[PDB]
Amino acid sequence: MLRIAKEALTFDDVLLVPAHSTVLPNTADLSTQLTKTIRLNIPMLSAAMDTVTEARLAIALAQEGGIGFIHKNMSIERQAEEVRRVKKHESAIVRDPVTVTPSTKIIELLQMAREYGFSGFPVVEQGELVGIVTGRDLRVKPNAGDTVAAIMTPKDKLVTAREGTPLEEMKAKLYENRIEKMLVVDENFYLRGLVTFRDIEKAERKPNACKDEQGRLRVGAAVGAGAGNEERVDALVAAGVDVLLIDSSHGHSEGVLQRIRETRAKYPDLQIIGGNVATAAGARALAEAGCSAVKVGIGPCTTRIVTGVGVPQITAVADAVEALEGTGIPVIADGGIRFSGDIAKAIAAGASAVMVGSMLAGTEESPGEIELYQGRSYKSYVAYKGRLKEIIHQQMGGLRSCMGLTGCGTIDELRTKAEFVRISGA
Amino acid sequence: LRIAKEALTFDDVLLVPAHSTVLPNTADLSTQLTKTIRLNIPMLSAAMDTVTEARLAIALAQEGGIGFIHKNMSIERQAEEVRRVKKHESAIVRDPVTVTPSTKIIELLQMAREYGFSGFPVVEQGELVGIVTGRDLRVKPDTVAAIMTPKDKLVTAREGTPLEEMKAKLYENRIEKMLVVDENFYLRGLVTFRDIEKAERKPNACKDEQGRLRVGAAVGAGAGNEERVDALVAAGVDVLLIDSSHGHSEGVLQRIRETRAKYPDLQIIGGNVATAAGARALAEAGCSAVKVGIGPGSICTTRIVTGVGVPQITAVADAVEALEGTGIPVIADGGIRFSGDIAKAIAAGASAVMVGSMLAGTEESPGEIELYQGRSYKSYRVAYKGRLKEIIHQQMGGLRSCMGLTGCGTIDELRTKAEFVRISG
Amino acid sequence: VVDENFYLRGLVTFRDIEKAERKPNACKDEQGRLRVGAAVGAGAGNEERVDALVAAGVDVLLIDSSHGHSEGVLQRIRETRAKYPDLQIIGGNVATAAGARALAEAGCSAVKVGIGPGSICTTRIVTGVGVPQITAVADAVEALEGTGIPVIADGGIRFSGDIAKAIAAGASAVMVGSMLAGTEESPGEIELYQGRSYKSY
Amino acid sequence: LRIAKEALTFDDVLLVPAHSTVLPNTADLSTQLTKTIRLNIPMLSAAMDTVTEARLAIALAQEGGIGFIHKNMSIERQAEE
Ligand SMILES: O=c1[nH]cnc2c1ncn2[C@@H]1O[C@H](COP(=O)(O)O)[C@@H](O)[C@H]1O
Ligand SMILES: O=c1[nH]cnc2c1ncn2[C@@H]1O[C@H](COP(=O)(O)O)[C@@H](O)[C@H]1O
């Protein structure tokens, strides 16, 4: 007998029923929990694709509320760097300022002063910040061949802030210490950058930046389920990554489940996402192995045509959610998302966020550099799509519009309150 | 039947390659726009509302050519565009946070906690009167006027001051901020060692004898433009574009004769013509340059509608030959599709080319970025072509190769030494 | 089968000599080895490459530039010729009578003609320079009418009729690219795509 | 205006047929490439990385013409080809 489990639905099969609503679109709460502990401001993830997510894009996205996942087609030593660039990224901090050493001749200092001003030259000998020289230090006339070491400000009398310090704290330190520039060190008092009042103003204001408990941007990064990835993991976790993505084309494989169990045994507090599954059991299987969230999407596609396996996206999500009802383990809709409507449907199926790839490739912040070809602008490594900021705004405009229509003020209500109609092709 | 001759366009000729001591990267793209104005690249931007405004006219000047502000706007804004270009210095911070002599010290401390007491410039109706700093409030003497630093002890630079001279002023006066005023001591901006440092370096800027970017501006040949001209000439436009759809009309020739007697020294471009007779006519009227192009525009609506036109190559050579002695240059206007067309235009005798379609849709052109379908466009829609600088490089890349192939190291050698072959389809 | 230093190179049986494909039209040298050319650029720093190929027994050397009529090409050609008085050299590309004698006097053994007509013709359009191929060939041929130095028609050969026209214009041989790219023996791997066979790079 | 001449391409001409004692299968396709090198067919393969390597340069030589190994490779491999 023909073994058909059920009937299965994709995006184009359903529409959301509009409801009574006290919800204005610009007042909708777009936030939602990615894991039990990580909470996004917009419910969006960027695919760990070499064409989609690198350090550049994953920052832009966190500033706007979501999280990017550094793709894994790069060395361990380099993937760990991309993770670190995001966590420590403050556009307000001037990162490559001109420094000197105690060995620097004062003669060379007046030369540089004529080229950067006596606002302040950081003195470093072998990375350790040891002091700074200002024009107020250069009073009285240097005898022939003096060096900075005699006139500089010592380490003890410096006013610094640590990296990851909030920005108004720095303003407070800057104002109350009646200074115009303040050095930013690290745990070991290594010079990391500097900050000014103006550099804080020209830092564009991202009120919905998705950050950690210490105000650093959040970042994810992806690894394989094959053997031998443990070292990359150790390197990434070392780089301070917020969430780890173990991506395979079959999350319900026992080998995936094992590397997860191992990674979970090794890093009990690390937020881990496993994927991809498309069934009630595949999600429950992944949860047991120790996921913090589960990514859903098997041929949302080329996978369906070559292997014949797949599940339409809407029922796949509903089944996973139905199985995870009560665990606080969220579902991620991955792939097949063309417009804002698919996003809205995804969440209303129960999904807590979505992952997109094609939609982001070609954005300014995406990998590749802009190249003009046949009078058109493209991203050379695809159609150049412009700034990510707008694509998000355009997409979230749509989502916001939807929540007003369905009377859902928050994401969780949309995942629970919104209703569907089953529809035909016509 | 009066058929004067046969006339040739771009697709009709190829440039013949010659002995060459010219590497493309060593070729001299400069050329004289008029006897007095000399370009660094032989490119003008069309005075089209979709192409040239202050923003793009700046970008092109930074690149070696000159943009022509279109005339489809009120004077008060057009003369403004001419200023926006002439006065543009990328290093100057404009619209900084200021106070007035009336500002309550109470209000002074609030802003200080949100911008720092580095110094708030004090202006009384735009006129710079002083600056109040944190040393002034802890020092004490109520309002800002009582604690502010007076006009006498201020260190300023005038607008248009070179950057190295400002840098010297900042060091020799031991300051990190220096305010920028104009002729009437009105505040225009400020400069620090850092903002002069991040100022983009444009070594091929077409600048005037005073280091300001050069700007053109276009007006029509009708009556009632006299006030517009005077406004632009007042606004410091470098060269004036008198553009008509028939440069060989007696009314054009007259208004040109008039403007020239009025501004004996003002550089004027008249157009458009496509004949030897149309060319001398415009020169005798007193043009400094002659623009050629009746019929070849991109969105070529003439001919078809009117039956009139000249294939662009024949027109240019004919005008060039008629002006062989006057030191008055010719411009090839419209119909430039690829960089090969540029090369052919110049080798026909042109001293520069004017382009529209090639530039419309760059970031710097008018219009807003808009995402449509799944691609980027400039919405007023046109295809977003990215930054102008990239296009210019590709286009001049092409021209350099041609000159390398043809053994012409300078534009002028290309205009005189390069040969053609005629070809079929 | 050994070589000059008695290093093993292979073996032969009565049978393997029997299945060896018989190519009666092989272009072989005065020593029955297949003839081979090799191409280098006209820039500086190729001197070591040339010497390596000449050492490797290349039969004829191809000095190819996008402008064979450049003085630098003419010079590097003058240099290589004084160095290998006997080495067969092909210079290109030109498209004029003047470009042709220039290359011959520099010491070319053959002259390659073709500025503008390549298949993926990116010149002209971009640079405005070129010559329709027939006129170029006849012009170079006529300029070399006495030198016993042959001309090659390079690029733009679409069909066999074009070959015939090229030669009848004066060409002694033709050089083709597009017509050959994608044959089994060209570089690339066989790949099945869509539902058809392609050579995947 | 300096227009040297008119210039012709393939589509511009046809070859005129003449009296003929020549059968196609009896035609001599050989020709001198240089004073010293003589081809059997009048064909060279372009020195293009997508066209000529040792493999194709062998096949063409077997057929009467000469292939030209492209230069987009390290010497040690080109001299090898
Ligand atoms: O409606 C029109 N008819 C004829 N020519 C025009 C029209 N609008 C603009 N032009 C000219 O077309 C030129 C630009 O040609 P393009 O480089 O091919 O786009 C400019 O110099 C304009 O003066
Ligand atoms: O980028 C290019 N521009 C111009 N000619 C080229 C380029 N690449 C290869 N060629 C030449 O094109 C010829 C092949 O022409 P085809 O027979 O039509 O494919 C060869 O002789 C090459 O030297």
Swiss-Prot record, chain D:
Changing D12A: Causes a 38-fold increase in the value of Km for K(+). No change is observed in the value of Km for IMP. It comes from the Bacteria. The CBS domain of IMPDH is a negative trans-regulator of adenylate nucleotide synthesis, and this role is independent of the catalytic function of IMPDH in the de novo GMP biosynthesis. Deletion of the CBS domain derepresses the synthesis of AMP from IMP. Belongs to the IMPDH/GMPR family. Catalyzes the conversion of inosine 5'-phosphate (IMP) to xanthosine 5'-phosphate (XMP), the first committed and rate-limiting step in the de novo synthesis of guanine nucleotides, and therefore plays an important role in the regulation of cell growth. Homotetramer. This is Inosine-5'-monophosphate dehydrogenase. The chain holds residues 2 to 82 of 488 of the full protein.
